[PDB]
Amino acid sequence: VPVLYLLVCAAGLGGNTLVIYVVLRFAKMKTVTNIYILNLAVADVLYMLGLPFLATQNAASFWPFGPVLCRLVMTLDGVNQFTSVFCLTVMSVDRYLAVVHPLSSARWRRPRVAKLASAAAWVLSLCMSLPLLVFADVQEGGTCNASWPEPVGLWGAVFIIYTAVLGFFAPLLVICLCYLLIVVKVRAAGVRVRRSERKVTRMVLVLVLVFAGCWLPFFTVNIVNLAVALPQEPASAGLYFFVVILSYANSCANPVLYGFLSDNFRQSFQ
């Protein structure tokens, strides 16, 4: 069990540091494209710190420490993960405007705009995670888990649905049309005048497949659990463990694809 937990962190830690330290020295920030990659790496590396605490709390041992740290770890753990979806979402629109409307979008490509967008994105994650501490405290009685201060029956269902609606669905809808329009456009220009359309299709298919596969299961599992109660049996814990371990591979898949597969970054890497 702990052996499995060690490997993910060991692999994850170095990849982000490599790119983040390479960016500053050689690829100095002088264009809009170079800004979002900065935020993505920071978000991923800050999220990657979470697992050891949960390893300590179930690895044949139960919660040490007191309430002082329980209601401090959970808030940051929750806040960290939500930034990634918005960070991924923005780039799609950015690139769509970069290729479909060159002249008409000259005003909005100025460097000043990106800073405001990043600063605005950084706030809503804190704005939305507050209920986790204010409405119900992290009562340490339940081994550092959360127990509601009011009748659980009503609020327990309220929490999951309202989190899930915003967590998963809308960005998935947003991305697809933007990624489709470019491929729709390419063929008309190509026909009138071999090697490129194959590559474009391959790239887009790979990034959609990875994105969807890395995240589908968890919400379905939670919804099914909410619908009907489950029995007590050792397989139930194993199911949860497998469902939870998968989520951390996204943070290790993300840094390499966007980073090292580009020609300009490779050339400047020397």
């Binding site: 949960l54 709390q57 179930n58 339940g142 081994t143 888990n145 959360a146 327990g156 659990n225 109660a229 489950l230 007590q232 139930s236 814990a237 949860y240 463990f241 939870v244």
Partner: peptide
């Protein structure tokens, strides 16, 4: 049974 992540 459980609620959230790694509770069980």
């Amino acid at each position: 049974x459980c609620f959230x992540k790694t509770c069980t």
